[PDB]
Design a protein around this ligand. Structure first.
Ligand SMILES: Nc1ncnc2c1ncn2[C@@H]1O[C@H](COP(=O)(O)OP(=O)(O)O)[C@@H](O)[C@H]1O
Lengths: 23, 57, 457, 602, 169, 396
């Protein structure tokens, strides 16, 4: 559970950064 | 009855001691009140405007 | 001297997430500073900045985050860490889990503003604790002696009378002036009344202080509840040279507040989901027990913890186990037989007992009497475990004597009234009258000189 | 560039900092206006992520972050032996003296060694102007303590030709004792050198380990021997005696110097060592002296900042390697290894590196491996030939007393000696609580070559001891289900002699005059008598069970009750008062008493 | 005998309660005296603000002190109507001293649209140009902030030093 | 007032223009007004854990925030009602909708409007008089048993400016008006209270008078006390019904609140069939125990937060009858199924699991629940004692 919550957090951060880089 | 008489006696004693303590408080207070009052009034008036220690440029 | 610079107040809440409020635009956030929060309805709250990054500050709120609002909430930054106002006048008083008074008295007029965290005591200055406290209870003063400046917890199964034992130590403990500090985390109302009433009945009010966080109070206050007690104990002991017994009730409810914060922050888990740092957090509490060089004072701790499902391998007892100078333990095997105080000696030990035991502190034999009582009681448990399978027909006569020793031992050594006070010397005379159950040559832990002087008495 | 960056953020021990472009990973940096010591652990651009070896409460964004270009390092030199240092190598005696307070102030700038004390320096007397000199060459002796001579040596990286060497005299840490020229460049040296803690001090060769590490304790000495230069762990639950073993090695062993490392340990423990060790005395050349003169303490107690535990371990081994290069048999007590793995866990949690097992970082196995592999016997660097060693003894402390814990699991993949401490023995107050089935020593083959030079009987006795205990543990799986009734007489002898060995050989009461330490001669003697009893008692039954006049285990117990009492009494012999000859003579009387009693049963 | 024990236990609890009441009366009395010393400090400040000379010196300080805590390019200063003439001069003096020490320009505006409550003794509150962040330089806020931190000196001066406090660890 | 739905992922709805909202504020989302709570704020955006099924909610649907957090309406009409876990009255829902279903996004007020109960004002009050939280400003005779005390909410205080005369009035009619600091508050018989917040009291007292169940085994061997907290192992073969029915028919408890915290569909209907049919003797009359009780009821398929909140609604209701001077008994019938609904919230919130997958705070959620029991000196003028007992069934 903990490992997978961290993976999902890293993906959320990478999604946000990828959107911010298009602005 | 002996317990009730002891309670009344102790009530008188702790009241007397309370009034003594309150008297000592009022005495020492009034003896120092003006000096402390002038100290707080000095430090609240001495502003010393300063930037925060981490400011840059 | 004092911080003269005026405080900033921010409305710049940029998020709220579980127990955390995330301020932004903050000018130079100070890590672990306190923030006073005012809610939309005018309710005052408090918090600590548990992370900082550039313009942001992640304040954890002590009273929880219900009713925090992202436009109206005002956060006043104090510019400094959490300080406890401390003074001698904190004796005879009751405070809540955040050090606010609840005895209907005034605010604490401070002699100083000590840091809630304290500071690490310098190992060079830490005087070794060796002067013996008698608690009055044979199962403690005999086989689990307590030094002035020791930390030693009571471990309990759920529902056991550990509160009555902790009360009895505060009722009857002393040397061969002991002020008291008491903290409780997540304590039920009836137990809060029990401790408060016990101190009032024993009359020892002018030299005790209480910090109470009840089971209905906010859980995050439990992080600072024992630290307030210790910060008061450090003032009384190290600045006023008093001796203090610090009681930490329900360290399990404390550890659950850490488990809650850990889970709510996504902190890296250790065993059972407690935070990976739980050992250090417990150490920052427990290690403030001790004597120190050139000061006559001493902080002694008796923490109390109920073990979840009575499991000794649970992180709460287990990490406490590593940090403290041995354990006092209480057990259903005694309590279910009405053996108050239900202190099982075998899982119990005191790491500082060996240094406290000896001449002038105690009778010279005391170390040896203890060593043999443990051996006889241990064999007694092992022969009981055998008998339950095979009956007396497969036990030896000597094994049946250790089974009889176990019965005589619990009924005389451990069994003791809630107001019955025993010195160590009477406890050792009882210990010898139990050890006399075997022939002299069987007492294989004791030297022949000690046997020759004391065995026939 | 700026010589300092600025704090960008804080989270427990971790501090991120801006304007840290041009910083090395593992560079030491000072954080906050108070100069909290820390070390760079990750780089993210112009930002550096720092691990701070002091409590970060009160650090502010925009506080200074001073670079140094140097990794975390130890000043090595005179003033170590008999001193005590915090986890970042600051001496606590000076901190008390300068501060007059019971607390370590955060951001203390004290030098790691006293620069004002004068030391007696004897130069090597073979060196001259123009002598060629290399790393690890001894350029003099300092009379630091009556027991320990500090063989000051050229830093291992340095090389050169002697240009100045100081005459005999009294000098301090600032006095240039040696000056070298090499390749048109000069180097000036005092009696102190700076070495990076994360860097292994090199050696001429890592030699085979073939000499026992003699200790205070019977079962450690005999049944699971450690070797000088060996790697050892003591996995054990709380209250099991991991600390009593660690001090037993420290107080009573054949090591020339001891480095004791209170990594994450309760504070009363470092105080216990500091109080007890100056009173306790060893003897050299018929002169009694305080064991503190051969001990060096690294303190970093359970309530000090977790990051300083990693710094404490690496400091303690760096010190240990220095004394090894002086040609000493060094011993290092690592008083807790899981407390270091917890520091690595918390930091890795702030870095958000994926956890491996129990939340520990995946590099824990490499951290422990690269720590334990700094142990060994070695041929030292530099001109005069020396042999020395570091023995490392890691007090692994698995949560819940379960040896499957990742710190234990990773440790036992590396170390060559396992003294597993069993909570069930500790509960029964059987100390040392070492479980003899679980425990192992891999150095036994390497030590049999030594035992044959002094005690040819020992390898037979050690073998027979394990046979007695193994047969008893296997018989116990029956006894637990059927009771003490169905056993043969040989099996009852095995059971009762294994209980004699448990109670009177494996147990040792380390808080008493007779069991405080147990010299190796008492160890072989006690074991020889108990195994002699076993062999004779076995032969008596096995010979007579073939006939009507059968001897029984009860007949042996009843007829030889005084012998069983005498065998049990053997522990109480006092090594200070009962001389070695007297103990051997008393044990020979027991041998003859047995032989006469068995001859009376025959 | 059990009833007599209960009477004796009640007697003990009553004696404890009498001592508790006495201790709490003594504590309340100390805090009341300290409270009235702080009230006298508020009264003395209420006299000081009547002198435009000393009060302009305070306002020159307090406005600049607020500017140095907020550090923004645009700010708003709130005062009472009575303060306004002095506060406008204080802002006009403070902008130079701010720009000198911080190098950068600032646009500071006196808040003639939203005065402070007249029951405040004096001083100023400074806000960002978006009103989202503030700093309290009112004489009451600065007094309470200093007087609270000075509470140990206040206690030690008004009631004498506690003879037990032999160390400062 | 209105925000707009920004996005939806399963039962979680993100909203925007929510800048004035609060953590744990209760919000209606979608045109059908689905219930949910704010679990996070992120600027002007809020994340709402919706309780009900979110199927059909659209980006740009209205988000009407209720100013208060999750709360219980308190007043007359509580007696005899079958509330659900969020105080939607199932009787009003049935009567108004004429349907066997609960329709998604009910708006029915918890206390029925237009029922003009007989009200008597407190005879001691006058225009100008002082009043404080817990003061009785009148009585509503809703049932022959429960003279329902109407009393000022615990935060409110001031000087009385109007009281209604004796007459017929409902939950929405203004009964009391008072001024404090120059500000006037108008109050009705309805009161609203945050369900997770303890109602404050003059003193939480020790529990010392027996709560008789009328069963020899309980009252003799293992007594319980008014204000006390007790538990029962609830299972099929346990016989819990014998305790439960006997407590409601015979206990010396002036009000009973029963809470179905996620009972099975059919097992809930067995309970809701029995409690109307149960009758009690009072003053030599026979009357339905529904004159002295209220049922919170939730089947296992009710919204997760309706199950999780149902225990807290029961004790919020019970504290309100405690504050009237009544010796309240609360029965909770399935504390295991409540802890499952609690666990489901943590699983949707992705909070880290503790022991056996339950949340870390389970100990605190239970402990702060049972600590809401006890005898008390109530707030306000009549000095009245009152109490809440809690029976908490558990399913090992
Ligand atoms: N070898 C020993 N001989 C005698 N007693 C011992 C010995 N080892 C441990 N003990 C006893 O058990 C206690 C626990 O040992 P200790 O070193 O304090 O445990 P820990 O493993 O936690 O460090 C000691 O304080 C002492 O009372």
């Amino acid at each position: 559970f903990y490992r997978l919550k961290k993976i999902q957090e890293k993906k959320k951060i990478i999604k946000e950064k990828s959107e911010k880089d298009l602005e | 009855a002996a317990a009730l008489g002891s309670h009344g006696s102790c009530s008188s004693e702790v009241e007397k001691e309370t009034q003594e303590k309150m008297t000592i408080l009022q005495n020492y207070f009034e003896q120092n009140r003006d000096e402390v009052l002038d100290n707080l009034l000095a430090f609240v008036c001495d502003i010393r405007p300063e930037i925060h220690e981490n400011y840059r440029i | 001297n004092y911080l003269s610079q005026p405080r900033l107040t921010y409305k710049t809440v940029s998020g709220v997430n579980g127990p955390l409020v995330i301020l932004d635009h903050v000018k130079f956030p100070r890590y672990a500073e306190i923030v006073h929060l005012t809610l939309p309805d005018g309710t005052k709250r408090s918090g600590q900045v548990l992370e900082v990054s550039g313009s942001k500050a992640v304040v954890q709120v002590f009273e929880g985050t219900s009713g925090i609002d992202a436009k109206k909430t005002s956060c006043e930054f104090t510019g400094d860490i959490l300080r406890t106002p401390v003074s001698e006048d904190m004796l005879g008083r009751v405070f809540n889990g955040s050090g606010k008074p609840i005895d209907r008295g005034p605010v604490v007029l401070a002699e100083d503003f000590l840091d809630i965290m304290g500071q690490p005591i310098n190992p060079q200055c830490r005087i070794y604790p060796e002067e013996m406290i008698q608690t009055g209870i044979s199962a403690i003063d005999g086989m689990n002696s307590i030094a002035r400046g020791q930390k030693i917890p009571i471990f309990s199964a759920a529902g056991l009378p550990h509160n009555e034992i902790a009360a009895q130590i505060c009722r009857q403990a002393g040397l061969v002036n002991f002020a008291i500090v008491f903290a409780a985390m997540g304590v039920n109302m009836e137990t809060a009344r029990f401790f408060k009433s016990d101190f009032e009945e024993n009359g020892s009010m002018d030299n005790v202080c209480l910090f109470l966080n009840l089971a209905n109070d906010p859980t995050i206050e439990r992080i600072i509840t024992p630290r307030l007690a210790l910060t008061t104990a450090e003032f009384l002991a190290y600045q006023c040279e008093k001796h203090v017994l610090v009681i930490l009730t329900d360290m399990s409810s404390y550890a659950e507040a850490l488990r809650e914060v850990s889970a709510a922050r996504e902190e890296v888990p250790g065993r059972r989901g407690f935070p990976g740092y739980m050992y250090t957090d417990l150490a920052t509490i427990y290690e403030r027990a001790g004597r120190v060089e050139g000061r006559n004072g001493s902080i002694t701790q008796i923490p109390i913890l109920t073990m979840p499902n009575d499991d000794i391998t649970h992180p709460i007892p287990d990490l406490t186990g590593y940090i403290t100078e041995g354990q006092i333990y209480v057990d259903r095997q005694l309590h279910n037989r009405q053996i108050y105080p239900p202190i099982n000696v075998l899982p119990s030990l005191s790491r500082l007992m060996k240094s406290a035991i000896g001449e002038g502190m105690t009778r010279k034999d005391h170390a040896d009497v203890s060593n043999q009582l443990y051996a006889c009681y241990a064999i007694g448990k092992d022969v009981q475990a055998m008998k339950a399978v095979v009956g007396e027909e497969a036990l030896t006569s000597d094994d049946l004597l250790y089974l009889e020793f176990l019965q005589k031992f619990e009924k005389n050594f451990i069994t003791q009234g809630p107001y019955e006070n025993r010195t160590v010397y009477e406890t050792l005379d009882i210990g010898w009258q139990l050890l006399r159950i075997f022939p002299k040559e069987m007492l294989k832990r004791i030297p022949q000189s000690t046997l020759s002087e004391f065995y026939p008495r | 560039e700026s010589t300092f960056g600025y704090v960008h953020g804080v989270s427990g021990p971790v501090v991120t900092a801006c304007d840290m472009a041009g910083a090395a990973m593992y560079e030491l940096v000072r954080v906050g206006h108070s100069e909290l010591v820390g070390e760079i652990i990750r780089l993210e651009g112009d930002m550096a992520t720092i691990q701070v070896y002091e409590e970060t409460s009160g650090v502010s964004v925009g506080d200074p972050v001073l670079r140094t270009g140097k990794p975390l390092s130890v000043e090595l030199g005179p003033g170590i032996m008999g001193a005590i240092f915090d986890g970042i190598q600051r001496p606590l005696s000076d901190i008390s003296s300068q501060t007059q307070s019971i607390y370590i102030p955060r951001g203390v700038n004290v030098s790691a060694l006293s620069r004002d004390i004068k030391w007696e320096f004897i130069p090597s007397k073979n060196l001259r102007v123009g002598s060629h000199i290399t790393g690890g060459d001894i350029y003099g002796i300092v009379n630091e303590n009556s027991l320990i001579k500090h063989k000051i040596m050229l830093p291992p990286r340095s090389r050169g030709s002697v240009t100045y060497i100081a005459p005999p005299g009294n000098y301090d840490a600032s006095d240039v004792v040696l000056e070298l020229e090499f390749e048109g460049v000069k180097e000036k040296l005092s009696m102190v050198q700076v070495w990076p803690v994360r860097q292994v001090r090199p050696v001429t060769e890592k030699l085979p380990a073939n000499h026992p590490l003699l200790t205070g304790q019977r079962v450690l000495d005999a049944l699971f021997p450690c070797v000088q230069g060996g790697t050892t762990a003591i996995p054990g639950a709380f209250g099991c005696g991991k600390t009593v073993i660690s001090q037993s090695l420290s107080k009573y062993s054949n090591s020339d110097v001891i480095i004791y490392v209170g990594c994450g340990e309760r504070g009363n423990e470092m105080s216990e060592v500091l109080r007890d060790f100056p009173e306790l005395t060893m003897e050299v050349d018929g002169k009694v002296e305080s064991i503190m003169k051969r001990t060096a303490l690294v303190a970093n107690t359970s309530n000090m900042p977790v990051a300083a535990r990693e710094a404490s371990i690496y400091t303690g081994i760096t010190l240990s390697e220095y004394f090894r290069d002086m040609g000493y048999h060094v011993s290092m007590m690592a008083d807790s290894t899981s407390r270091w793995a917890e520091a690595l866990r918390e930091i890795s949690g702030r870095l958000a590196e994926m956890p491996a097992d129990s939340g520990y970082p995946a590099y824990l196995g490499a951290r422990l491996a690269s720590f334990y592999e700094r142990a060994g016997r070695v041929k030292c660097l530099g001109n005069p030939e020396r042999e020395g060693s570091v023995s490392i003894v890691g007090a692994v402390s698995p949560p819940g007393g379960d040896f499957s814990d990742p710190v234990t699991s990773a440790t036992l993949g590396i170390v060559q000696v396992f003294w597993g401490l069993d909570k069930k023995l500790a509960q029964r107050k059987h100390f040392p609580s070492v479980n003899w089935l679980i425990s192992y020593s891999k150095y036994m083959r390497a030590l049999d070559e030594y035992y044959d030079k002094h005690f040819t009987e020992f390898v037979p006795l050690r073998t027979k001891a394990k046979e007695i205990l193994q047969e008893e543990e296997d018989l116990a799986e029956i006894v637990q289900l059927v009771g003490k009734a169905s056993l043969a007489e040989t099996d009852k002898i095995t059971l009762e002699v294994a209980k004699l060995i448990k109670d009177d050989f494996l147990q040792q009461n380390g808080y008493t005059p007779y069991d405080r330490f147990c010299p190796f001669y008492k160890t072989v003697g006690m074991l020889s008598n108990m195994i002699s009893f076993y062999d004779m008692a076995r032969r008596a039954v096995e010979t007579t069970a073939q006939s009507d006049n059968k001897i029984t285990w009860s007949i042996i117990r009843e007829h030889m009750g005084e012998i069983l009492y005498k065998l049990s009494s053997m522990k109480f012999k006092d090594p200070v008062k009962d001389g070695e000859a007297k103990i051997k003579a008393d044990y020979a009387q027991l041998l003859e008493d047995m032989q006469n009693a068995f001859r009376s049963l025959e | 005998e059990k009833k007599e024990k209960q009477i004796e236990q009640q007697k003990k609890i009553q004696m404890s309660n009498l001592m508790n009441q006495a201790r709490l009366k003594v504590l309340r009395a100390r805090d009341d005296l300290i409270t009235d010393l702080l009230n006298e400090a508020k009264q003395r400040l209420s006299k000081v603000v009547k002198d435009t000379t000393r009060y302009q010196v305070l306002l020159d300080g307090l406005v600049l002190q607020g500017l140095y805590q907020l550090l923004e390019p645009r700010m708003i200063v709130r005062c009472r109507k009575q303060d306004f003439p002095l506060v406008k001069a204080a802002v006009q003096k403070a902008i130079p001293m701010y720009k000198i020490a911080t190098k950068k320009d600032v646009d500071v505006q006196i808040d003639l649209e939203a005065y402070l409550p007249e029951d405040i003794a004096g001083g100023v509150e400074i806000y960002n140009g978006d009103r989202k962040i503030k700093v309290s330089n009112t004489l009451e806020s600065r007094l309470d902030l200093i007087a609270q931190q000075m509470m140990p000196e206040v206690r030690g001066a008004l009631f004498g030093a506690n003879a037990n406090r032999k160390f400062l660890d």
